[PDB]
Design a protein around this ligand. Structure first.
Ligand SMILES: O=CN(O)CCCP(=O)(O)O
Ligand SMILES: [Mg+2]
Ligand SMILES: [Mg+2]
Lengths: 436, 436
């Protein structure tokens, strides 16, 4: 199929296949991301989906039919013996009970692809308790309780990673390159073609969501900035880069303008200092990620100028693609074959994803969910978040409004209360104790 | 300096530095590329230049003065005991005797940065004979005798690699990624901003060479196509990708047109078949390298289209930079720390860099050198090369014309004779005997 000789990670995956025992993924969630992963794995060597769960059993069969064209690879399992039988018979065992997957002895690595943060919290800690590696796609959960999950993974001798293919992990590839070379990372982040619309709600997008089948919440959280705030917080929390101002600058800049824009004001850009996470509004940046780096030696500056990388001392490194869920099996391969993580949070977070009201709300109302009507994410430094008593955005779904809140106002422990009994609130309390 | 926490390779280098015994490079050649490597290593952790040689000892001191601003780090050594003392004192030992570097017990890896293929052949086999890893920057030598060097490296238990940062090795990063994902590699290569000029000579470039203080042969070999032929042959001989036609198509195509141009004729492109090395003439491809890949599943096509990566089933993956000599220390780090090569030739070459005359020549004339007046490189498949009895281009410097040759004609064992005594012709004979 590939037309090429096997090299690097491809060759390692071919050698694994030759052992007769593939790397086996337990995949939790059969929606769009999950369905993508089944499809992607079916063309790789040495890596298989052993079992697939969803809240409703029909969805597992649906994912598998979309991947293969029919449901013949699927076999329902309601017990461990049935599941292990199915896997050894070369079937994908399907179930609506996540615990059968999380506890099966043949499963090497867990991927949660449900897009539900509370669920990413629940399944993540259970995967670690059961002695399985854990590949996290729920960035909303990672930026809330990632440090805690990583510490628990270390105690059990397993690996925790964000999955490759999304902007934060793609951007870590560039960051590792620039910093291994000893260069200053001035700014890093992602682009957007068009201005954000912070007032967006599902009323503006229901029509498009319906025609494209897709979850209207995704459009909304994309357009209102929330996903951008979350992705940039994950980069910050893995590096020590910080937002320069709450919400970031988000200037207008094409790909060719980043290196004169997301740089210090002293050198003509918009930043108060070097070492930031930010994003741009303009052409040619998306669908990838970037790092603006500085050169510290005149010879290195000259060499990059001769190669037409730019005009120094600031230079833009672009990765012009990210394939989302399709890259996540490469993380699985590196984790199991090489014992390497693609991306972990630092022990001490430097940014918090906070939230701002999208409309006026009164005491007794409930906050809804990201990508809906009540609030949108807003990145702050930890010290500014704490000073303002901001509630982490991952805690807010179905939270209670306790004092009047006006449009544009920060959501805080003074004006709202999270549902106290969430797994995610419980794990975040444990994280806060561990840090203190 | 970097503004970021240590991750990945950057972390592995810092951990090496904490052992107090850095990875030590033996660097042969104090000119431009060698001076770049001294400068670049000086900003990194865990890796140092232990020793540096040049034909004329003053040029070692000159390279050191450029990198550091003074010669305090240099110490002259003409014996093993003096070189080892200098390295232990934290100096870069400088010498005019390559054999001292090739045989010093404290040197881990050899890099030949002279740009002379004969010397890359000579120091290459010597490095391997002395039990040292070998990073080759001389792509002209690698395409001539690489399979032999690789086989001898394997016999000695050391690693052979092309150095990162040049088009062939940068392109291998993309090929590894697409092929690990199970995707079809349709075409791979590099771009040039402007059309080739096959008739170029140093007469045309002496003013640019003079004002840029650079070797006029490098401009000529760039413009007349020779460097592109060599670089594409390296990719082909590492992958099994082949030139579609002798010389390659080299169509007019911007970055945004690659995926409708370097694809099969049946789908509107220029190629007779999928699985090729080629290049483009047009805007936005250089500096950098590309792979055109094909999707063979509707869901994968649909995901790449929704991400705006292109319109399927063909998609362009671009790495919009390559830093030349600056990335070579990354190869050195991967080789020593992880035992991984960045790029090796396959055991059976599929392409040959041959040569065509730039002017009419008479029996008894000598061929000059690449980037001068007499000849320019031209990629062919191995079977076509053999059928024409073509001489590998790397063997031709100072060769003798034995039958009349017309401008544009292939140089073959029927109309020319290499200098027989070269280490490079001697090693090539051994490669041919190994492959017989
Ligand atoms: O991984 C994919 N994305 O982040 C796309 C979400 C749209 P945005 O880039 O507008 O937040
Ligand atoms: Mg994303
Ligand atoms: Mg090159």
């Amino acid at each position: 199929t590939t037309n090429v000789a096997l090299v690097g990670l491809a060759r390692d995956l071919a050698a694994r296949a030759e052992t007769g025992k593939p790397i086996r993924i337990g995949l939790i969630g059969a929606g769009e991301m999950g369905t993508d992963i089944v499809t992607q794995v079916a063309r790789m060597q040495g890596i298989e989906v052993g079992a697939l769960s969803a809240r409703r059993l029909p969805n597992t069969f649906k994912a598998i039919r979309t991947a293969y064209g029919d449901e013949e690879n699927a076999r329902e399992a309601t017990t461990e013996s049935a599941m292990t039988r199915a896997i050894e018979a070369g079937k994908i065992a399907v179930t609506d009970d996540n615990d059968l997957i999380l506890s099966n002895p043949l499963i090497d690595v867990i991927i949660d692809a449900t897009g539900i943060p509370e669920v990413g919290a629940e399944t993540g800690i259970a995967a670690i308790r059961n002695g399985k590696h854990l590949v996290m796609m729920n960035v909303e959960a990672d930026v809330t309780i990632g440090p805690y999950l990583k510490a628990q993974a270390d105690k059990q001798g397993v690996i925790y990673s964000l999955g490759a293919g999304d902007e934060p992990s793609s951007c870590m590839e560039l960051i590792e390159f620039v910093s291994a070379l000893g260069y200053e990372v001035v700014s890093a982040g992602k682009g957007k073609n068009n201005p954000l619309n912070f007032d967006a709600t599902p009323d503006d997008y229901r029509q498009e969501a319906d025609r494209r089948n897709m979850n209207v919440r995704l459009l909304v959280e994309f357009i209102d900035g929330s996903k951008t705030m979350v992705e940039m917080a994950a980069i910050a929390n893995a590096t020590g880069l910080v937002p320069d101002i709450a919400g970031m600058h988000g200037p207008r800049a094409s790909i060719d303008q980043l290196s004169h824009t997301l740089i210090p004001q002293a050198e003509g850009g918009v930043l108060s200092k070097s070492g930031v996470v930010d994003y741009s509004i303009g052409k040619g940046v998306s669908p990838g990620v970037f790092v603006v780096a500085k050169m510290d030696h005149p010879r290195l500056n000259e060499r990059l100028e001769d190669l037409k990388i730019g005009k120094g001392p600031y230079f833009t490194f672009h990765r012009p693609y990210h394939l989302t869920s399709l890259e996540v099996p490469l993380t699985v391969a590196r984790v199991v074959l090489h014992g390497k993580t693609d991306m972990v949070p630092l022990p001490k977070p430097v940014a918090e994803v906070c939230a701002v009201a999208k409309k006026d709300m009164q005491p007794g109302e409930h906050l809804d969910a990201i990508g809906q009507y009540c609030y949108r994410s807003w990145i702050m430094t930890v010290p500014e978040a704490r000073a303002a008593k901001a509630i982490p955005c991952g805690l807010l779904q179905n939270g209670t409004v306790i004092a009047p809140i006006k449009k544009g106002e920060l959501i805080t422990y003074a004006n709202a209360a999270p549902q106290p009994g969430s797994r995610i609130a419980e794990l975040r309390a444990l994280q806060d104790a561990m840090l203190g």
